[PDB]
């Protein structure tokens, strides 16, 4: 009898390549058998019909009924890598902010502003030329514009009049673009945002992805704040540069993993003025196109499937020494 490691997520999800990868890897655990459930059975069957498993790697991404895997795992009780309730919290930005700063977590200054969809003037915005304030708090420009939607990639930068003015919109990568100047200078004007503090870094942001809290690898990209044009290599993938988290980063990375309950798990950093500040936590991640992670990836998450569940199944297990890469 193997420990059953089943895989829930939508088809995009369960079969890119990095997914593939690590599955690959992690059934190459003598004790271990990986069931991917098919989108058509997560959609559309009643959980009572789910394969079963003994460990469940379930994570909410667009269109997924997190509902339906909230609901088979408090049937089936399998041990659960990334937490499914905390995954409602990760899908809006104030929740996510509000578990950075419960942790001491470095961020950026922000302010809410919840606008009533049938009473949209009645918020608490004033709009000047170059900030705004927000229930009272100033922003002067630059700053940043986000949807409460943690799904909504359409965030917006507003330059400060210095500076010409107008602003950056940013959104899911189309081709060789991630955001785009706007001649528009005033907010947007229906919605609820976040409005934070622009940071100042390099022009890159430092991307990071857990596996557990001792383990994370950092990758930087060519910030989409300033210029929209996608930088990429002669093989057509998006140009990283290497990266090593220094002691507070590492810090950062296990306090993410443990405060959002996401053994896998992405968020970012703005190294700004001799800082690091965590401007968004997208929960289940893996890293692309890295041989070194897909083996370092599926080794751990193979040992703590064997740690967690060897001693019920009456297997032997040794717990073996691990990077933190
Ligand atoms: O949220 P991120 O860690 O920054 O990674 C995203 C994410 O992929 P993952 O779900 O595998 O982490 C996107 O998926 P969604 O959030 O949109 O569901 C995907 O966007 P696609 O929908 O277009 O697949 C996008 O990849 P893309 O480069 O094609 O925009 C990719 O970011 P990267 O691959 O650049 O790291
Ligand atoms: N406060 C900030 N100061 C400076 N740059 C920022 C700030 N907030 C976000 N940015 C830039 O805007 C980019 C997108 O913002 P982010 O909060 O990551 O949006 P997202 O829609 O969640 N992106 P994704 O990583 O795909 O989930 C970041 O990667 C930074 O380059
Ligand atoms: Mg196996
Ligand atoms: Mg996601
Ligand atoms: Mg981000
Ligand atoms: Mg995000």
Redesign the pocket.
């Known amino acids: 009898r193997q420990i059953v490691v089943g895989i829930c997520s939508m088809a995009?999800?369960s079969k890119?390549k990095?997914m593939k990868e690590i599955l690959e890897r992690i059934s190459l655990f003598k004790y271990i058998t990986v069931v991917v459930f098919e989108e058509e059975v997560i959609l559309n069957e009643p959980v009572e019909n789910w394969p079963l498993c003994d460990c469940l790697i379930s994570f909410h991404?667009?269109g997924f009924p997190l509902d339906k895997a909230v609901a088979y795992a408090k049937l089936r009780n399998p041990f659960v890598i990334n937490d499914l309730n905390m995954q409602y919290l990760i899908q809006d930005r104030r929740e996510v902010y509000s578990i950075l700063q419960a942790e001491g977590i470095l961020l950026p200054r922000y302010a809410i502003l919840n606008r009533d969809p049938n009473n949209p003037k009645e918020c608490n915005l004033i709009e000047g030329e170059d900030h705004v304030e927000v229930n009272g708090e100033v922003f002067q420009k630059p700053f940043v514009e986000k949807p409460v939607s943690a799904?909504d990639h359409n965030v917006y930068i507003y330059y400060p009049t210095s500076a010409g003015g107008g602003s950056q919109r940013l959104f899911?990568?189309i081709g060789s673009r991630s955001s785009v100047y706007s001649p528009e200078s005033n907010v947007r004007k229906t919605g609820s945002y976040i409005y934070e503090e622009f940071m100042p870094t390099d022009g890159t942001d430092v991307?990071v992805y857990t596996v557990g809290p001792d383990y994370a690898h950092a990758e930087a990209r060519k910030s989409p704040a300033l210029d929209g044009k996608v930088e990429r290599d002669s093989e057509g993938k998006?140009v990283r540069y290497p990266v090593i988290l220094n002691a507070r980063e590492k810090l950062i990375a296990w306090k993410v993993c443990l405060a959002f309950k996401q053994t896998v798990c992405?968020f970012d950093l703005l190294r700004a003025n001799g800082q690091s500040y965590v401007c968004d936590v997208?929960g289940?991640?893996?890293v692309?196109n890295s041989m070194k992670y897909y083996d370092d990836c599926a080794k751990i998450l193979g040992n703590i499937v064997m740690r967690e569940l060897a001693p019920q199944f009456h297997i032997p297990w040794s717990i073996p020494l691990e990077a933190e890469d």
Do not use: D, I, M
Request: hydrophobic content about 10%; charged content about 55%.
């Open positions: 995009k999800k890119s990095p991404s667009k799904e899911r990568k991307k998006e992405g997208n289940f991640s893996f692309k």
